[PDB]
Design a protein around this nucleic acid. Structure first.
Ligand SMILES: Nc1ncnc2c1ncn2[C@@H]1O[C@H](CSCC[C@H](N)C(=O)O)[C@@H](O)[C@H]1O
Length: 327
DNA sequence: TGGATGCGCTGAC
DNA sequence: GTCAGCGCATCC
């Protein structure tokens, strides 16, 4: 994450729904905002959350009475994506994990915050011929909010990862916010090899598979794209090896393959997946963030998370728009 | 809501 | 045809 000198969100209160690692909390707090409520039902996510913020998030949002939720100015929610991701079965709203948005609508309808800041996977924008996004748009609209949605790639915001996600910013209508803008892309100057830990700390991640098939030549020049160098097995998910001179592939929560949830990388002649701390860095998390003691749970959490830097630039722009109140 | 890995199919070229 | 995906079902 980056440093924010102008705390655009000072004095504002927000809630952290589907909290996970608290990515939205880090981003909004760096802008001066105050978290007044968090909700996360996963046991291990709750532990790492408390480990970093000192509070245990409330469980199952579907069982929480929205009237009990504290007053807040900004509602943050990176809701479940398994049902909309290009990597899943795309059952969408028909999935028991695909209807969490209506819980968000329920909370908004009752708490009516100034802003609703949501995030989901790229395919969310195309799912069901665009009907899924349309439904969220109309729901927000009839809830009396404006709807700003756009898919941003983390590689355009200083993070070496081709992670694309849809960001949806909603302003209450009575606020007449007419100058909100998604952050503009800038040149990437950080690559995977810049975030890697020393070899001595990741030796245990070195995999020597005799079915490795290097398909491409290593590149000596850094590039803002993923560069596949080879595969193992059939080259499916978690079976692809990339260059550390390029950018990382999207970190995943339930990913499979020998290089599960991170992808494989060529590092000083050996192939290995990423270390939880490297996943943290690829997601824009500061080294001060405490990862979960279970590497398995940490991989799942970072793969489910958000890119801090991207949320910071957005949060900053949300605050800039809310603070523009000329006579 | 364990940890691990082989997998298959969709989306966007 | 190329290839990447906050995934999936199964195994222990
Ligand atoms: N019914 C429910 N109640 C509360 N939390 C839920 C939930 N269904 C899913 N979740 C939580 O929703 C999260 C979605 S992924 C969001 C991660 C978050 N942005 C962070 O930065 O890491 C998961 O952690 C999941 O456990």
């Amino acid at each position: 994450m980056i440093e924010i000198k102008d705390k655009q969100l000072t004095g504002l209160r927000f809630i952290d729904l589907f909290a996970g690692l608290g990515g939205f909390r880090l981003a909004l707090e760096s802008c001066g905002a105050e978290c007044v409520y968090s909700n996360e039902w996963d046991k291990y996510a709750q532990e790492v959350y408390e480990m970093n913020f000192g509070e245990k998030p409330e469980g199952d949002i579907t069982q929480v009475n929205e009237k009990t939720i504290p007053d807040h100015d900004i509602l943050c929610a990176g809701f479940p994506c398994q049902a909309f991701s290009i990597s899943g079965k795309q059952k969408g709203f028909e999935d028991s994990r695909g209807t969490l948005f209506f819980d968000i609508a329920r909370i908004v309808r009752e708490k009516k915050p100034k802003v609703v800041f949501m995030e989901n996977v790229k395919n969310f924008a195309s799912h069901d011929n665009g009907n899924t996004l349309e439904v969220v748009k109309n729901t927000m609209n009839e809830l009396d909010y404006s709807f700003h949605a756009k898919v941003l790639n983390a590689l355009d915001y200083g993070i070496p990862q081709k992670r694309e996600n849809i960001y949806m910013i909603c302003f209450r209508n009575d606020l007449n916010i007419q100058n909100f803008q998604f952050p503009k892309p800038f040149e990437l100057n950080t690559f995977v090899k810049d975030l890697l830990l020393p070899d001595s700390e990741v030796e245990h991640l070195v995999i020597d598979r005799k079915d490795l098939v290097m398909t491409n030549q290593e590149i000596e020049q850094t590039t803002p794209k993923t560069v596949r160098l080879g595969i193992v097995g059939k080259g499916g998910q978690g079976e692809r090896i990339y260059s550390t001179r390029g950018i990382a592939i999207t970190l995943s929560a339930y990913g499979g393959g020998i290089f599960a949830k991170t992808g494989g990388y060529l590092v000083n002649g050996k192939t290995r997946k990423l270390h939880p701390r490297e996943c943290a860095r690829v997601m824009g998390y500061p080294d001060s963030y405490k990862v979960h003691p279970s590497t398995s749970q940490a991989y799942k959490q970072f793969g489910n998370s958000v890119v801090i830097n991207v949320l910071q630039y957005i949060a900053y722009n949300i605050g800039s728009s809310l603070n523009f109140k000329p006579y």
